[PDB]
Amino acid sequence: MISNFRKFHGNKNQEKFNENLILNKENESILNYLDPICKTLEIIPEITYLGSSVEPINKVYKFNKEEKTSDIERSELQLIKMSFLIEKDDKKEEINKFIYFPKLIDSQYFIINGNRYYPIYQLLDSGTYRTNKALTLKTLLMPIVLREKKETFDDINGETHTMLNVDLDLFKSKVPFLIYFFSKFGFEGTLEYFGLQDLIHVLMKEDLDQLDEDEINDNVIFMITKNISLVVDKNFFSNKNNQIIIATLLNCFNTRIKIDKIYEKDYWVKKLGGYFTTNNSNKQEKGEGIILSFERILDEWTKKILRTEEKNKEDIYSVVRWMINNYLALVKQDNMNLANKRIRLYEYLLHPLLIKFSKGTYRVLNNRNSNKFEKIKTIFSNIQEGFLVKKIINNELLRYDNSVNSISLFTLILRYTQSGPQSPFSSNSTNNKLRGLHPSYLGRLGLTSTSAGDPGASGSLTPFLELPENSYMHFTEEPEINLN
Amino acid sequence: MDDISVIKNEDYEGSHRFLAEELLMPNANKTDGNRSTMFCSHLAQAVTLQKAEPPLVYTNFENQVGKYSTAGYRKANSNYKVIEKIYKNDYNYVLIVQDQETGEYTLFERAECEFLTEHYGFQWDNDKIDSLKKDDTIEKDTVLYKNTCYDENMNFGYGVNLNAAYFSYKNETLEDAIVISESAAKKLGTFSVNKVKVSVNTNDILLNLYGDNENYKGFPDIGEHIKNQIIASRRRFDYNTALYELKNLNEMRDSDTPFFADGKIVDIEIFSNVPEEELKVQKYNEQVLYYINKQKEFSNNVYQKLKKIVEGKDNNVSDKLLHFYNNCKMRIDENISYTYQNSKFSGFIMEFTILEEEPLNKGSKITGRYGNKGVISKILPDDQMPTVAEGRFKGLKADICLNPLGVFNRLNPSQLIEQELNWIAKFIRKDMEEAGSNEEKVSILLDFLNRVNKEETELMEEFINSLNKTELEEFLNDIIENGIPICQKPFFGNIGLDELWELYNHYDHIDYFKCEGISTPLIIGEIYMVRLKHEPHSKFSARSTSFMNLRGLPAKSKNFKEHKDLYSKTPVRIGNMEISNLSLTNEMGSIMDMLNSYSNNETNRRELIMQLLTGNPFDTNIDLSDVESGTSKILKSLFTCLGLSIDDV
């Protein structure tokens, strides 16, 4: 009996496969990912969230005479109910919407309209990575990006220095990153918040005349205006990362200034407005709006994903401070390493709802001289029970099941693609760097299986891979650069 | 790039944790990367074989792969107990089963086919489930039904073992070509199952293709096989003129719309949208009136069978059972109208599932494990193929001959190692078979296994000493008949070069086989073969005169997708450089005449068609006319829309 011996010899193996990794798709729950997308809509002050849940669907049909309509083809769906409380001065409407989402049958595929569809993992960088002359951080909808430009400065004695200035390329504009803090917390507020208020001082012309001569070498004095001078320490100026703040601060100011205008927030709030709106009448008001938007760029999911400590995760300002403190180390890191990449399965499926909600909320954010309640109602008025299914199928988010063999473990169960929504990969872009290999690939990915149609856009996970638990599908637990 | 320095071979010792999809292919540390990377795609495209066999040289890794692939077999999650089983058709029937640990209820449905994709599928080898009957007990590890790949004892297999040799046959193996004996072609097989959706309206009728007027069999029966590759043909009927149209329904007419398919019909299902009272009287719509009724009967059965279960106080049912119960109770009710593609059709529409076995034919492709891809060129009767007629074992005949020219040029020496291993296995097996009692026979085996894979010797000894005398004798007879399996791992643990040298040196009584009418020593081994998806009938196309586009140029028509025609009647376009390469010859007027009379001018096309049809068939002397072409008119209209015109002189 050859077969009995073969079975015994197979059972006496030692390098068994990883059971947990293969049967993973059924562990994911839609309700876990549903919350951040709904909470995104909270930008409008009136709208308040109330949660969402899965509704029961089991029911025994009772005989009826109502000319019922039934479909020829079979499909499996599941009902999700969301609730919102729209509150106004007198109206306190409650809106309950229902959405259909496909259910995972046999733990592997969806069945829609008699056809079978296989979900696939997507591989993407964790964030805070580096691109050509820029440092970018991925986000749900708004990709905040920092851009650096070299500049030249001359001191009092005439020594020339070349430094760097950083701008936040947000809202299709180039704006210094210090003016946001100067508008929010103020001059002294920003100085205290950064922690450099003990090293930065501003002196007038009369104080410049009475400047400490013996402290000139110890404390380098830099020009601000024709009369106002800046007092800063050379020891603080030693580090380039520290010098970044000095360069940006000197770049922010202009020739025209007033001593009492420095302590006034409006003095540069109107400057930011003029940067945004050219008309003088609204220079204040429009600027205020931007500030509000700048406090809602970051959402909860990006907070949960990031691996930084709690102290550097309070809000957008703390994130910007932590990013700008360690600019050099972050820009010195590479990109192709696998230590800072993750895999998504459902967040790239729930895209159309987020897109629709953003499109709806922008319209009501840009409304003027009208009643808000009607527009807020129109935001939620259109919710089709076949919205998600139609948008998913039409845009080809899911991949059609076209296989002929019964060997499915290596073919479709473990397959990852770098293309799709928010994918830097693009055939016409001709980015040959992304299609290459890195020494970190070995041990956690397949170096052989590649699609012949387009190399590098499809591989296969190693069956022996052990994803660490409680890390939200992270290959490692620490970034490539320790930063410690 | 100095990033390689992080990689250290000290930790990657004795563990295959860095291989994906290469676990199946053995001796992976010999072939290059360019040929190895083709194996992944080759495994991705591999159709099912009827007579699947486990590989002779196994990597000890395919068993777990087969176990963890749940797309081909279905086992029992928990211990069940059969409650009831009901029939639906000649073959397909369902059964309702109940747990013994939770009280829930589930259903299991027996089938005879599966639609993997638009063309390819397989047939369920449902044997254990059929034996289950009359309130039996299902255990945890039992498997209900399985695909054709899996064998009796869960051992995987995705190919066949064929006797092979490296030889040249009348230059028929140039480039990548393979000859194959008739017996091997008989051994190799494939399956094919397809679904066809025919449609019938109120005006249309069905011709009496099968049977006489007594039995107006419009379509084949449940288990019969179709003939002439025509499943059913429907003819439009008009109220105004039907006296001279419906005189004889036993023959095809000029304006017909037949449906083409091939195979054996296994499953049908009919959905109707007309009142039954109007359908009861029509004589030509007879067979449908049969099947529909039968179908409804089945539904009624379930409504009278388990209505005490779901409608009772327990209600502990799974989602699948409840959904199926609601779906089946939908039909027996009244005033129900179906819809298709978000539209309400008028006449009834059915479904057909057709199964067929396709044998190996010229033009197909077969490849080995190491990506030595080839193409079948010419099959021969087994008599013509080379045979050995001098040695002790006269009679062995090679089944496939491979190209010997491109073995070293292709940079993949694994095939030679595999063939040498199988040849040494053949020699040692014959030596063992010649003489020796069971007391020492196993020793003759063990020695050979001692110099190939040291890990296998311990398991060999344990298994051999575990059994008793009769089973040991049966196992020895079986290994004598089929052959000694040899195991070696892909990357870490295998034979290289020094081991082969020592193995050759130790056995001094081995010489090449001397064939007949060859005068050159030759070796024949056994190699693993897997079929591929690529077929000649999936891309062949021809076109005489199909439907024309709205503008007037020929265009692709969607009829082959709905099984309304045999060939994919798609024209081939002339590319940008094709016209220039044709213009390589100094003649240009002939090119212009050909293009204009083929796909530009309607009057010229009609004149050519007529002049070709009527006249002299042996010798043709057509004379084209001069009429302004369509493309010139299109261009003139577009340019005069822009505001510019092309003026001669």
PDB file of C-alpha atoms in Angstrom, chain A residues 1-19 22 57-76 103 105-106 108 116 118 400-411 415 437-439 442-450 452 460-464, chain B residues 1 3-4 6-7 12 15-24 37 40 43-44 46-48 54-55 58 60-61 63-65 68-72 114-117 120 147 151 153 155-156 158 271 303 310 319-320 322-323 326 329-330 333-340 456 459-460 462-463 474-475 478 485 487 489 533:
ATOM      1  CA  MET A   1       0.000   0.000   0.000  1.00  0.00           C
ATOM      2  CA  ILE A   2       1.856   3.042  -1.299  1.00  0.00           C
ATOM      3  CA  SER A   3      -0.949   5.446  -0.367  1.00  0.00           C
ATOM      4  CA  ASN A   4      -0.927   4.513   3.329  1.00  0.00           C
ATOM      5  CA  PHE A   5       2.833   5.017   3.578  1.00  0.00           C
ATOM      6  CA  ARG A   6       2.546   8.327   1.724  1.00  0.00           C
ATOM      7  CA  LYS A   7      -0.124   9.550   4.145  1.00  0.00           C
ATOM      8  CA  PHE A   8       1.932   8.457   7.158  1.00  0.00           C
ATOM      9  CA  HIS A   9       5.086  10.142   5.842  1.00  0.00           C
ATOM     10  CA  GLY A  10       3.139  13.322   5.137  1.00  0.00           C
ATOM     11  CA  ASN A  11       1.657  13.305   8.634  1.00  0.00           C
ATOM     12  CA  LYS A  12       5.124  12.848  10.151  1.00  0.00           C
ATOM     13  CA  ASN A  13       6.224  16.260   8.847  1.00  0.00           C
ATOM     14  CA  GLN A  14       7.389  19.102  11.088  1.00  0.00           C
ATOM     15  CA  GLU A  15       7.234  22.426   9.190  1.00  0.00           C
ATOM     16  CA  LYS A  16       3.462  22.728   9.264  1.00  0.00           C
ATOM     17  CA  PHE A  17       1.681  25.701   7.725  1.00  0.00           C
ATOM     18  CA  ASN A  18       0.315  28.677   9.655  1.00  0.00           C
ATOM     19  CA  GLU A  19      -3.361  27.927  10.279  1.00  0.00           C
ATOM     20  CA  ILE A  22      -5.137  31.444   6.020  1.00  0.00           C
ATOM     21  CA  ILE A  57     -32.797  39.285   8.521  1.00  0.00           C
ATOM     22  CA  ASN A  58     -34.284  35.900   9.475  1.00  0.00           C
ATOM     23  CA  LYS A  59     -38.004  35.718   8.702  1.00  0.00           C
ATOM     24  CA  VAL A  60     -40.627  33.171   7.655  1.00  0.00           C
ATOM     25  CA  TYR A  61     -42.656  34.379   4.684  1.00  0.00           C
ATOM     26  CA  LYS A  62     -46.439  34.520   5.059  1.00  0.00           C
ATOM     27  CA  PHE A  63     -48.775  34.061   2.101  1.00  0.00           C
ATOM     28  CA  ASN A  64     -49.599  37.366   0.413  1.00  0.00           C
ATOM     29  CA  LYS A  65     -51.301  38.695  -2.727  1.00  0.00           C
ATOM     30  CA  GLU A  66     -49.391  41.844  -3.680  1.00  0.00           C
ATOM     31  CA  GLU A  67     -47.811  41.023  -7.087  1.00  0.00           C
ATOM     32  CA  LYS A  68     -44.350  40.374  -5.687  1.00  0.00           C
ATOM     33  CA  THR A  69     -41.255  40.686  -7.878  1.00  0.00           C
ATOM     34  CA  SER A  70     -38.432  38.146  -7.650  1.00  0.00           C
ATOM     35  CA  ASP A  71     -35.060  38.049  -9.384  1.00  0.00           C
ATOM     36  CA  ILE A  72     -33.939  35.192 -11.611  1.00  0.00           C
ATOM     37  CA  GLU A  73     -30.334  35.164 -10.378  1.00  0.00           C
ATOM     38  CA  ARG A  74     -29.163  34.517  -6.828  1.00  0.00           C
ATOM     39  CA  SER A  75     -27.311  36.988  -4.614  1.00  0.00           C
ATOM     40  CA  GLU A  76     -26.538  37.268  -0.900  1.00  0.00           C
ATOM     41  CA  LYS A 103     -21.712  38.758   3.092  1.00  0.00           C
ATOM     42  CA  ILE A 105     -19.940  32.890   2.259  1.00  0.00           C
ATOM     43  CA  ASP A 106     -17.623  29.863   2.545  1.00  0.00           C
ATOM     44  CA  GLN A 108     -13.641  32.965   0.699  1.00  0.00           C
ATOM     45  CA  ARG A 116     -18.478  34.716  -7.825  1.00  0.00           C
ATOM     46  CA  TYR A 118     -12.773  36.897  -4.721  1.00  0.00           C
ATOM     47  CA  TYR A 400     -13.634  38.685 -11.247  1.00  0.00           C
ATOM     48  CA  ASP A 401     -13.034  35.029 -10.397  1.00  0.00           C
ATOM     49  CA  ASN A 402     -11.407  33.540 -13.518  1.00  0.00           C
ATOM     50  CA  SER A 403      -9.601  30.337 -12.532  1.00  0.00           C
ATOM     51  CA  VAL A 404      -9.555  26.833 -13.976  1.00  0.00           C
ATOM     52  CA  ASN A 405      -7.581  24.719 -11.470  1.00  0.00           C
ATOM     53  CA  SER A 406      -8.659  23.421  -8.073  1.00  0.00           C
ATOM     54  CA  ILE A 407      -5.344  24.467  -6.482  1.00  0.00           C
ATOM     55  CA  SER A 408      -6.551  27.671  -4.825  1.00  0.00           C
ATOM     56  CA  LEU A 409      -4.154  28.121  -1.888  1.00  0.00           C
ATOM     57  CA  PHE A 410      -1.254  29.626  -3.859  1.00  0.00           C
ATOM     58  CA  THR A 411      -3.412  31.146  -6.599  1.00  0.00           C
ATOM     59  CA  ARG A 415      -2.560  37.171  -3.424  1.00  0.00           C
ATOM     60  CA  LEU A 437      13.009  43.912  -5.009  1.00  0.00           C
ATOM     61  CA  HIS A 438      14.470  44.630  -1.580  1.00  0.00           C
ATOM     62  CA  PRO A 439      16.398  42.376   0.825  1.00  0.00           C
ATOM     63  CA  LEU A 442      12.953  37.601   1.590  1.00  0.00           C
ATOM     64  CA  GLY A 443      11.404  35.777   4.535  1.00  0.00           C
ATOM     65  CA  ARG A 444       7.981  37.440   4.334  1.00  0.00           C
ATOM     66  CA  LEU A 445       7.054  37.523   0.620  1.00  0.00           C
ATOM     67  CA  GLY A 446       7.409  35.534  -2.582  1.00  0.00           C
ATOM     68  CA  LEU A 447      10.323  36.532  -4.798  1.00  0.00           C
ATOM     69  CA  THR A 448       9.267  34.278  -7.698  1.00  0.00           C
ATOM     70  CA  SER A 449       5.534  34.443  -8.465  1.00  0.00           C
ATOM     71  CA  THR A 450       4.909  37.473 -10.685  1.00  0.00           C
ATOM     72  CA  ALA A 452       3.550  37.989 -16.713  1.00  0.00           C
ATOM     73  CA  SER A 460       1.981  35.936  -3.324  1.00  0.00           C
ATOM     74  CA  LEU A 461       2.396  35.914   0.446  1.00  0.00           C
ATOM     75  CA  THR A 462       4.639  33.314   2.041  1.00  0.00           C
ATOM     76  CA  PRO A 463       2.479  30.632   3.718  1.00  0.00           C
ATOM     77  CA  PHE A 464       4.815  30.546   6.745  1.00  0.00           C
TER      78      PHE A 464
ATOM     79  CA  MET B   1      23.666  48.426  -3.771  1.00  0.00           C
ATOM     80  CA  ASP B   3      22.018  46.279   1.200  1.00  0.00           C
ATOM     81  CA  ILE B   4      22.658  42.566   0.551  1.00  0.00           C
ATOM     82  CA  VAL B   6      22.132  42.219   5.974  1.00  0.00           C
ATOM     83  CA  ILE B   7      21.213  38.803   4.534  1.00  0.00           C
ATOM     84  CA  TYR B  12      18.318  30.298   7.081  1.00  0.00           C
ATOM     85  CA  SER B  15      13.974  25.538   6.893  1.00  0.00           C
ATOM     86  CA  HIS B  16      11.998  26.406   3.753  1.00  0.00           C
ATOM     87  CA  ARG B  17      10.456  29.622   5.066  1.00  0.00           C
ATOM     88  CA  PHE B  18      11.441  31.720   2.021  1.00  0.00           C
ATOM     89  CA  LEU B  19       9.635  29.867  -0.784  1.00  0.00           C
ATOM     90  CA  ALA B  20       6.155  30.602  -2.145  1.00  0.00           C
ATOM     91  CA  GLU B  21       4.651  28.429  -4.926  1.00  0.00           C
ATOM     92  CA  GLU B  22       8.062  26.741  -5.363  1.00  0.00           C
ATOM     93  CA  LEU B  23       7.396  24.122  -2.675  1.00  0.00           C
ATOM     94  CA  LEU B  24       5.912  21.803  -5.307  1.00  0.00           C
ATOM     95  CA  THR B  37       9.434  32.049 -12.678  1.00  0.00           C
ATOM     96  CA  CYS B  40       4.247  29.811 -11.230  1.00  0.00           C
ATOM     97  CA  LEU B  43       0.735  26.038 -12.220  1.00  0.00           C
ATOM     98  CA  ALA B  44      -1.748  28.921 -12.352  1.00  0.00           C
ATOM     99  CA  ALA B  46      -3.457  23.846 -15.358  1.00  0.00           C
ATOM    100  CA  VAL B  47      -6.768  22.172 -16.229  1.00  0.00           C
ATOM    101  CA  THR B  48      -8.088  19.082 -14.446  1.00  0.00           C
ATOM    102  CA  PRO B  54       0.251  11.209  -7.392  1.00  0.00           C
ATOM    103  CA  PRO B  55       3.770  12.130  -8.533  1.00  0.00           C
ATOM    104  CA  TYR B  58       7.289  13.860  -4.354  1.00  0.00           C
ATOM    105  CA  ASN B  60       6.528  15.867   0.780  1.00  0.00           C
ATOM    106  CA  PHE B  61       4.793  19.270   0.704  1.00  0.00           C
ATOM    107  CA  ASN B  63      -0.298  16.857   0.992  1.00  0.00           C
ATOM    108  CA  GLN B  64      -0.675  19.837   3.331  1.00  0.00           C
ATOM    109  CA  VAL B  65      -1.336  22.102   0.340  1.00  0.00           C
ATOM    110  CA  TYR B  68      -5.623  23.425   3.219  1.00  0.00           C
ATOM    111  CA  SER B  69      -7.256  24.015  -0.194  1.00  0.00           C
ATOM    112  CA  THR B  70     -10.973  23.827   0.615  1.00  0.00           C
ATOM    113  CA  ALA B  71     -12.280  24.628  -2.883  1.00  0.00           C
ATOM    114  CA  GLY B  72     -12.480  20.993  -4.002  1.00  0.00           C
ATOM    115  CA  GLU B 114     -19.511  22.698 -11.203  1.00  0.00           C
ATOM    116  CA  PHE B 115     -19.079  25.888 -13.233  1.00  0.00           C
ATOM    117  CA  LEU B 116     -15.594  27.137 -12.382  1.00  0.00           C
ATOM    118  CA  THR B 117     -15.693  29.666 -15.232  1.00  0.00           C
ATOM    119  CA  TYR B 120     -13.935  24.860 -17.787  1.00  0.00           C
ATOM    120  CA  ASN B 147     -13.049  16.327  -6.923  1.00  0.00           C
ATOM    121  CA  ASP B 151      -7.539  10.052  -4.473  1.00  0.00           C
ATOM    122  CA  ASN B 153      -6.850   8.534   0.959  1.00  0.00           C
ATOM    123  CA  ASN B 155      -3.320  12.149  -1.332  1.00  0.00           C
ATOM    124  CA  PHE B 156      -3.055  15.023  -3.788  1.00  0.00           C
ATOM    125  CA  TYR B 158      -2.291  17.074 -10.466  1.00  0.00           C
ATOM    126  CA  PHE B 271     -38.742  29.804 -15.394  1.00  0.00           C
ATOM    127  CA  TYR B 303     -43.484  22.673   1.874  1.00  0.00           C
ATOM    128  CA  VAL B 310     -38.913  25.982  10.649  1.00  0.00           C
ATOM    129  CA  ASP B 319     -29.061  30.882   7.326  1.00  0.00           C
ATOM    130  CA  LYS B 320     -28.637  28.654   4.265  1.00  0.00           C
ATOM    131  CA  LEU B 322     -33.878  29.309   5.880  1.00  0.00           C
ATOM    132  CA  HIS B 323     -32.935  31.061   2.638  1.00  0.00           C
ATOM    133  CA  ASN B 326     -38.055  30.781   1.584  1.00  0.00           C
ATOM    134  CA  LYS B 329     -41.833  28.429  -0.864  1.00  0.00           C
ATOM    135  CA  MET B 330     -41.854  31.482  -3.145  1.00  0.00           C
ATOM    136  CA  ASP B 333     -47.610  30.813  -4.220  1.00  0.00           C
ATOM    137  CA  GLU B 334     -49.769  32.835  -6.623  1.00  0.00           C
ATOM    138  CA  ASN B 335     -49.359  36.059  -8.610  1.00  0.00           C
ATOM    139  CA  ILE B 336     -45.559  35.929  -8.858  1.00  0.00           C
ATOM    140  CA  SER B 337     -43.661  37.334 -11.845  1.00  0.00           C
ATOM    141  CA  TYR B 338     -39.908  36.990 -12.279  1.00  0.00           C
ATOM    142  CA  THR B 339     -37.544  39.565 -13.764  1.00  0.00           C
ATOM    143  CA  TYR B 340     -34.285  39.280 -15.703  1.00  0.00           C
ATOM    144  CA  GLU B 456      13.476   8.573   4.580  1.00  0.00           C
ATOM    145  CA  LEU B 459      10.326   6.125   8.333  1.00  0.00           C
ATOM    146  CA  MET B 460      10.919   3.261   5.894  1.00  0.00           C
ATOM    147  CA  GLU B 462       9.340   2.040  11.086  1.00  0.00           C
ATOM    148  CA  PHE B 463       6.606   1.457   8.501  1.00  0.00           C
ATOM    149  CA  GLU B 474       1.143  -7.102  -0.506  1.00  0.00           C
ATOM    150  CA  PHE B 475       3.122  -3.864  -0.157  1.00  0.00           C
ATOM    151  CA  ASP B 478       2.672  -3.296  -5.106  1.00  0.00           C
ATOM    152  CA  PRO B 485       8.801   6.319  -4.668  1.00  0.00           C
ATOM    153  CA  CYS B 487      11.481  11.699  -1.892  1.00  0.00           C
ATOM    154  CA  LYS B 489      13.150  18.329  -0.709  1.00  0.00           C
ATOM    155  CA  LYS B 533      -5.235  25.593 -20.532  1.00  0.00           C
TER     156      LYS B 533
END
